[model samples]
Target: LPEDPRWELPRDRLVLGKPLGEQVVLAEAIGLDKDKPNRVTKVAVKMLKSDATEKDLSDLISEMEMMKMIGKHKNIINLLGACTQDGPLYVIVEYASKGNLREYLQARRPPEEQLSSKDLVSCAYQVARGMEYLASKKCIHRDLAARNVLVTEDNVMKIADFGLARDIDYYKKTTNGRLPVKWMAPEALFDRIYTHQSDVWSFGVLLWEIFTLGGSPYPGVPVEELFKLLKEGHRMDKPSNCTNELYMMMRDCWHAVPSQRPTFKQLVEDLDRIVALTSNQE
Candidate 1:
């Protein structure tokens, strides 16, 4: 068959099946190399089942096309290419050498490697900026968590893992599938409704993860009891390393009503301001 779309290649395009990190696999591809050999590069390819229904496959294609169209942004992982028509479908993105943000934070740190509070705020600011761009483009990153954000060797963070992402209009009345409950919003947990505001809620959880150096949220709380805890207005305790100002931002993001949560734009601004103030203090 004809190549699926621009940058859509056959399965052979990727070297295939080399673990790079959690849920991420590395590959070397010369995608469009005949079109431009100088651009040849390594990629992180995420595979999905080839036996999925036509509707699911179509949605996957649409999502990848959107990723390609979203193009290069410093904080958004670049979609290098894909392989949809072949045996195992793949979404290929630029390889991030340092792996994911959470893992990078959790690895044993030397005294010199210890992150200052300023750097911590800066990290959250970068993520907020990326989410702000997605919100501007009307995209809802349903799975916004520390593990989904990739880090580069230079300490740059890029938002990755769009497996559960969808446009603002794509809402489900009910879902029986698994979800990241600890990081999900109340609306998503109860009604299966997902929006940019719900993403804001997830972002708050991500910030908690960052401040805690990748500590798990809702420790000791079973998934079944999570809803009751949230329903009763319980939220995550502040990370010991987190500043009061940043904790307040996290609280605002967990507002019971979706509309009450801060917009990504506002979040970016708030985080930027906090980072600036903290930098000067140090």
Candidate 2:
């Protein structure tokens, strides 16, 4: 009865979604009209509401609202508008022409064809900035995988997909059904409690994901044995192109003890230092 929150039908030909949260959809797009600006314009019709099996419609609505309030960070994709009723909900989001990080890695073909070190640093900066901002807002991106980071044609990065996000203060523990456990930190797997520290641990994994040009989150490791391996202290090896500093930074972030993980502020500042150094060389 309602449209997907991720899409909007514009004039029966075009579809565009708002950012990660919010139910605003631009279903139709019109080429620049003589009276309008030269760029294309997407017209919004209504909100999108979908029955999410992971949670309920109310939870989705609440999360979207929070995302809106915490929308200042350049990394967190912001919603434009929303439409809602009893069941159906729709949202409008930034149009990312370059698609997500996963898509970019997949299209890059070879690992050597992956993102340059400079761009990777920039991406990490933005993501850390966004993560820091979210942490300031007391929220945690439970799922910090590569697929959730979106990039644009200009190499601008945005953190997308907040469906699995939760406010740490109000976080509910999940025992069985949880966010993808592969990218998850060790403490999160055992304790079922997550804080800014756990998020930092995941961020380490995300950094590897970027540096490796979309390398598998867990390579040469089986699903069942992953936890045991992590307990035994196995850090992901640095990719070929990764600098020693970057590798060490990743290792620091992924310390087995969650409490040892860096805070978002520390992460942002550290990444900024790295990015500044990388920029100077270029």
Candidate 3:
């Protein structure tokens, strides 16, 4: 749409299905290649709401550009193509057949497969590994909660929904709807400041989401109370059955001093070891 041939798919090439969201619809898409021109691949076609304002279109395009620039990673969403010059804009991304991690955790844990400690830690590691890659590009995924992470078939995890993502050394926020209030770091909650360090804080909460099997963060706590609690240095208690080692690594991401927060590199390393050691005990 901007002028580059980043492989835009026409509306005719996409057969859309039931809504995966208010604006996003599932689709079987084409135009990715010549070798398999007729092959239709499963994708989610994201669109802005019918009543979406000009600002909403800009915001949607911003996300599209960021995802395009971010390119491919195993644990991040893949932008298959787009339909930007048409009647309506469409961002075609790879479909997560298994849906978001929160939904997967709440409903679809395999009955036969034991939900082992290693399995959960591995999920954290995959997210850390993806966030680690984002760090390399100096991108801040402003929100990294459970719903933002996708779980495909075979338990593969991908970080998607880049509506609030930014490539900045540090960002000062201004959002109207859907702020990740529950996932904000102290600086973010207190002063509207966000950095890669803020993301580490969210990842700590995300790991809690992991271990809790989709329980809401800060259960029984309201927004106002969470602000006061966080200011007083109160963090969430350890999730049940979470090993001491795993909880230790999680809290490391919650250090009061932002600089004290461990990098995703450290998280990946810690989770890597935790998964290995725990699985070997099986």
Maximum-TM-score candidate: 3
lDDT of 3 by residue, 61-171 (tens): 888888877778888887888887747888888789888888777773544245677778888899999899887777888788888899886788999875354432123
For model 3, the stretches where C-alpha displacement exceeds 4 angstroms are 1-3, 108-113, 163-179, 280-282
Worst lDDT run of 10 residues, candidate 3, spans 168-177
Task: For model 1, give the 10-residue run with minimal summed lDDT.
Answer: 169-178
Best by lDDT: 3
Ranking of models by TM-score? 3, 1, 2
Query: How does each model score on TM-score?
Result: 0.81, 0.75, 0.90
Q: Scored by CA lDDT, what does every candidate get? A: 0.78, 0.66, 0.79
Candidate 1 lDDT score at position 163:
34
How far residue 133's Cα lies from its native spot in candidate 1, in Å, is 0.9
Which one wins by TM-score: 1 or 3? 3
Question: Per-residue alpha-carbon lDDT of model 1 for 1-282, expressed as tens digits?
Answer: 236567776676567757865345877886446667546577788755536677676676676778866666789887777776646668788777876788778873434267778888888999999988877777788889888898886889899865353442223211322236888898987898989999999999999989888777866666668778988999888988778888999999999999999999999998888887885333
Which of the two candidates, 1 or 2, achieves a greater TM-score against the reference? Answer: 1
Kindly report which residue stretches of model 1 are placed more than 4 angstroms away from their true locations once superposed: 1-5, 8-17, 21-24, 30-40, 48-59, 83-90, 108-112, 163-179, 280-282
Ranking by lDDT: 3, 1, 2
Model 1 residue pairs with clashes? none
